[PDB]
């Protein structure tokens, strides 16, 4: 999988089969790292008008 | 089955008969009725092409459709803006209530402010906000009023009118007591002013009564 | 700075046909605009495409167009509805609804011209400095209640008067300007005064 | 700020009228040399009526006043040929 | 493909601006009703029948709400009848008295006058009524005594 954005360190429990994560709307929203079981979160940087 | 319109009343008409009521009951209902949405703005390249070249130089190709659709947005905005600027701000001087509650058999409790919470709003104005409950360009613009101003202008309209009644409207407001208002409310509906000056426990009574079956029922229904 | 729909609306529509000129040259995924370099340079079986995607182009162009103009007349049609019914219920008479034709208590309008609107001269009442005065519900003389039948009952401190709660014109209350509807047992802050009797 | 970020002006702790709005209450003029301000728009005066149960205030005077409220009625005329538009 | 991709979301766009702007519309004409019923009946009192309230319209106080406002209207309705009979004028002195202000109603032995939306019966002077005219032409004219002070 691709994307663009920051990776904080969320605390959205997964279930231990499950491997990314979505939302209401059907786009990634977290992936669990491979090496270590640490599940981070994919929000996109600031953006607007000026 | 097959709907009914309702019941089926044969008034006794009469070239010689007249009805005329004896008593009156004080009936207080309710309204509501929508003012502004939210201002949302959508973008078109964020949307359209999300990190690309090539797509937005096939995008520049279909003319300024993206110049369109953002006028459209700011002008659905603004319009939003301006339709709770001309509900609520339409006081000049914001009015404040006496401390002193000397409205006779008047108990106006569930409207007036409760100076306890940061966002000072009535008891009837907290049921109706509990009652009702940036991925690919999106973006929510916050509006002007917040909630505080607008429960600050409806607080001073409500003092304005319980006080000076009908007279801060057209200019300067004038104090006046509660009951020679209410006469002059029964006076404008053709009753005179004695069924008022003699009845003002029963009316009292009727109207707090109202406001207890109003709350009640906003509170119990969903 | 009171003429700013009437410049508004001008402006919009300058910009849409501004905008649909415009929109009148561009490619919309082609070699060029201009169709008849298209064709000449081209075959016919790539033309035909070509004429194909402006035409579709310039169709959903023209359709966008149509649906403003339809929302703006939808707009300027309300607007006309409520200036008429301004201009029907102000102008040709006295309106009792408050706020709507003037701040004030409405006397009279005078209706005047604009490019594409109109321009009202609403003339209202507005009262001036006020002065605060005692009142009465009622007053008591021989154990009756008389109520006024048109005004306020104002005391100066000394004596009492009888006017018109719009106007200081204080009147000699006499039996006259007032009516008894009973005794002087229900009614609160009933004060004891002296009813001129002709 | 409440509904973005500002950058360019000060945060003066008055309350004067909104001269132009940014959002959720935050307004900026151009004042006393003279800087942009950041300010809070106030919804107005502080008015407080004394109300008693045995007083009445009728003014002694009056003043006419005209006021003015403009409206728009009709919009341009303009119509526009398929063909030509399209196939010129 | 890129294109396609283009033109869709360009018509789905599209699409959603203009529900936006019919929805936008319909909020504004709900905005200008809610604004000219709070200018109408809040400050101040209306005469029009079932426009604030179902009744006579008294006062009302207006109360915040999310994304809307809310009236409270404080009507004024009737309550138990009671049939009586009536009569357009009273003949005493061969001429006709009609009632300055209010409805003439009769007990059933004697006749009083009083006023309509409340029964409050009172006697019929010649401060409650007006001579005009004599008893050749009203239709139901009764006889009676007009009393004098
Ligand atoms: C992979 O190796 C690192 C150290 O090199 C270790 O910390 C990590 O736990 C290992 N991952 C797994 C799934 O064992
Ligand atoms: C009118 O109705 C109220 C409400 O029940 C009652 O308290 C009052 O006694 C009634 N008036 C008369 C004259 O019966
Ligand atoms: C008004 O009503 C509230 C709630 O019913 C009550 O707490 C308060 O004591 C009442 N005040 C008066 C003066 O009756
Ligand atoms: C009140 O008015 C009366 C009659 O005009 C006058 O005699 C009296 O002096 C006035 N009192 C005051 C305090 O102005
Ligand atoms: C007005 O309020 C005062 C309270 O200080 C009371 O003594 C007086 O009786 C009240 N008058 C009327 C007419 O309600
Ligand atoms: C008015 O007169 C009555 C009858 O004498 C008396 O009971 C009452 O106290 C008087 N009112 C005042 C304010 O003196
Ligand atoms: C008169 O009334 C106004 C408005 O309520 C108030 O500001 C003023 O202090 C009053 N003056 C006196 C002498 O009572
Ligand atoms: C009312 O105000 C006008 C305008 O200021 C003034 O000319 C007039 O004398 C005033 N009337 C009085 C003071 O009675
Ligand atoms: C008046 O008469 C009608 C029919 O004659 C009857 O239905 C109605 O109940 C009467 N009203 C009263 C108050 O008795
Ligand atoms: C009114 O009529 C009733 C009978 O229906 C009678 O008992 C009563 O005395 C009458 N009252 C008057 C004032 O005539
Ligand atoms: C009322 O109608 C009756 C019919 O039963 C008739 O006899 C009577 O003359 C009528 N009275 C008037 C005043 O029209
Ligand atoms: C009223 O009096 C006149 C003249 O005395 C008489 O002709 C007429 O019949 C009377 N009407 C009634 C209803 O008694």
Not at chain 1, 30 to 48: K, M, N, Y
Not at chain 2, 90 to 117: A, C, E, R
Not at chain 3, 15 to 42: E, P, Y
Request: some cysteine; glycine content about 6%; hydrophobic content about 35%.
């Amino acid at each position: 999988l691709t994307g663009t954005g920051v990776l904080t360190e969320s605390n959205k429990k997964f279930l231990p089969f499950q491997q990314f994560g979505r939302d209401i709307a059907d786009t990634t929203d977290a992936v669990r790292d491979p090496q270590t079981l640490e599940i981070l979160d994919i929000t996109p940087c600031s953006f607007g008008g000026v | 089955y097959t709907m009914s319109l309702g019941a089926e009343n044969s008034v006794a008409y009469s070239n010689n008969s007249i009805a005329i009521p004896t008593n009156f009951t004080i009936s207080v209902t309710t309204e509501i009725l929508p003012v502004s949405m939210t201002k949302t703005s959508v973008d078109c390249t964020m949307y359209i092409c999300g990190d690309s070249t090539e797509c937005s130089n096939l995008l520049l190709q279909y003319g300024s459709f993206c110049t369109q659709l953002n006028r459209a947005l700011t002008g659905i905005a603004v319009e939003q803006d301006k339709n709770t600027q001309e509900v609520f701000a339409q006081v000049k001087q914001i009015y404040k209530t006496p401390p002193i509650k000397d409205f006779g058999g008047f108990n106006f409790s569930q409207i007036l402010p409760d100076p306890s919470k940061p966002s000072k709003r009535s008891f009837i104005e907290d049921l109706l906000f509990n009652k009702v409950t940036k991925f690919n360009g999106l973006t929510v613009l916050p509006p002007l009023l917040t909630d505080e101003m607008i429960a600050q202008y409806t607080s001073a309209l409500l003092a304005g009118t319980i006080t000076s009644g009908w007279t801060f409207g057209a200019g300067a407001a004038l104090q006046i007591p509660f009951a020679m208002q209410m006469a002059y409310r029964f006076n404008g509906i053709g009753v005179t002013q004695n069924v008022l000056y003699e009845n003002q426990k029963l009316i009292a009574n009727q109207f707090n009564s109202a406001i207890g079956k109003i709350q009640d029922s906003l509170s119990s229904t969903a | 700075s009171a003429l700013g729909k009437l410049q508004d609306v001008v402006n919009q529509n300058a910009q849409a046909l501004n905008t649909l000129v415009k929109q009148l040259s561009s490619n919309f995924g082609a070699i060029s605009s201009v169709l008849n370099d298209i064709l000449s340079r081209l075959d016919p079986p790539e033309a035909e495409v070509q004429i194909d995607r402006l035409i579709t182009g310039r169709l959903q162009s023209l359709q966008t167009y149509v649906t403003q103009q339809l929302i703006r007349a939808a707009e300027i049609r309300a607007s006309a509805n409520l200036a008429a019914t301004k201009m029907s219920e102000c102008v040709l008479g006295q309106s009792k609804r408050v706020d709507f034709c003037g701040k004030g208590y409405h006397l009279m309008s005078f209706p005047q011209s604009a490019p594409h609107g109109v321009v009202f001269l609403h003339v209202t009442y507005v009262p001036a400095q006020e002065k605060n005065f005692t009142t009465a519900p009622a007053i008591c003389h021989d154990g009756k209640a008389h109520f006024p039948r048109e005004g306020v009952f104002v005391s100066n401190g000394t004596h009492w008067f009888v006017t018109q709660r719009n106007f200081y014109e204080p009147q000699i209350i006499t039996t006259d300007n007032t009516f008894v509807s009973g005794n002087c047992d229900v009614v609160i802050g009933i004060v004891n005064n002296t009813v001129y009797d002709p | 700020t409440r509904a973005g970020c500002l950058i360019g002006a000060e945060h003066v702790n008055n309350s004067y009228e909104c001269d132009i709005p940014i959002g959720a209450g935050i307004c900026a003029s151009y004042q006393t040399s003279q800087s942009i301000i950041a300010y809070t728009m106030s919804l107005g005066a502080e008015n407080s009526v004394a109300y008693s149960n045995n007083s009445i205030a009728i003014p002694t005077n009056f003043t006419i006043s005209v006021t003015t409220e403009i409206l728009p009625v009709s919009m341009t005329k303009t119509s526009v040929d398929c063909t030509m538009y399209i196939c010129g």
